[PDB]
Amino acid sequence: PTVERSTRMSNPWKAFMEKYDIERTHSSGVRVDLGEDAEVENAKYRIPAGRCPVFGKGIVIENSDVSFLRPVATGDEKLKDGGFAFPNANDHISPMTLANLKERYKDNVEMMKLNDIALCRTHAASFVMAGDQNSNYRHPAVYDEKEKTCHMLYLSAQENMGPRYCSPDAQNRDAVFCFKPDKDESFENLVYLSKNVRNDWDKKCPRKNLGNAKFGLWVDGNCEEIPYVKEVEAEDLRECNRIVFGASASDQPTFKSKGRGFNWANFDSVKKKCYIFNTKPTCLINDKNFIATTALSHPQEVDLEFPCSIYKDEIEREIKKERIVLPRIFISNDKESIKCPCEPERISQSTCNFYVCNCVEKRAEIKENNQVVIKEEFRDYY
Amino acid sequence: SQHATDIGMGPATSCYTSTIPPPKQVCIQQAVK
């Protein structure tokens, strides 16, 4: 009967971390999303294309007291007296309460399967321009989860700066307003939705912040710290989430980010510090002092239940296969299961009471650009 | 107008069609300023 260490280099966090691969799952701008081109009347237009919802995002209109959720100004009204939302129509398609969407689609069997956000999104995304369409152009939506109201947006624009392009001067009521995307308490229950958002966003996209956790990089059997991060002062989680959103993937002209950007952040709730980074995380570090957030994530919701069993499940799973080949997992809540040559270290900040075997042959490391690479001694074997 | 296009301003619109059955033409009451 033999016991040995496997040479297979995998990652037990793969299925769990998929929703945090913003470039793969959202695939468009976050702060400013304008990832899809649309030709209307032989003219080219930019529309939001992200596949995930953006929680807590709203549009701040500079030196205006009008919410962006108010309808756009029409005919007899001045530009600066309205918002961004769809205006009054022969059929009241926007704003629409959940009860109204439920009445409108009461006979549609397939639509009865949708969650409130997916229902609002499908509703807004169903409207094609009349006559000569030929276009993929659709309007985005904003679902208000507190007010249970779906708002179609007439304007797909998210940011406008520069004195020559806009007027912040509230005494110049006739001209174009200055605006920017942002997250604040007044927008916290809002859900910014492009026409492309996944109906199964609850399984594939971020929402809740991860308590007792910080984002990390899987380095041959343990979740390690991200070496290159940008530290910022943040009084609370809301501030850290607002900072990461501000620094996130932008499709705004300087233009398709494809979801690449400073999308993730680690919040130290004791030190009051926000560490933002632009490389996708591949695991979580169980640390009682941290909250892991994204630019897509809810400004306040926290899930404190760290998936403690991830390592033990995978070790036990593999042992159900006399040759025993142990996986390259050097962390666990069952210290003996690791089969460590020295005494495993007890991680004090770990709520899962994890033990780490530091004294093992490591075949990978992190380089200057946060890239996990195979060590030179092992490159030939792999 | 190149700036306008670049930041996400859209075409002049008025009438739409829902693709979810039953289809119905919806038109904006007043033209957008």
Automatic annotation (TrEMBL), chain A:
Localization: Membrane
Disulphide bridges: 52-205, 120-150, 166-178, 223-283, 240-274, 308-352, 340-357, 342-359
Taxonomy, superkingdom: Eukaryota
Keywords: Glycoprotein, Membrane, Merozoite, Signal, Transmembrane, Transmembrane helix
Topological relation to the membrane, as annotated: Single-pass type I membrane protein
GO CC, any one term: membrane
Entry's family note: Belongs to the apicomplexan parasites AMA1 family.
The protein's name in its UniProt record: Apical merozoite antigen 1
Organism name: Plasmodium vivax
Gene name as annotated: AMA1
Part of the whole protein covered: 43 to 474 of 562
TrEMBL record, chain B:
Disulfide bonds: 15-27
Name of this protein: Rhoptry neck protein 2
Species in which this protein is naturally found: Plasmodium vivax (strain Salvador I)
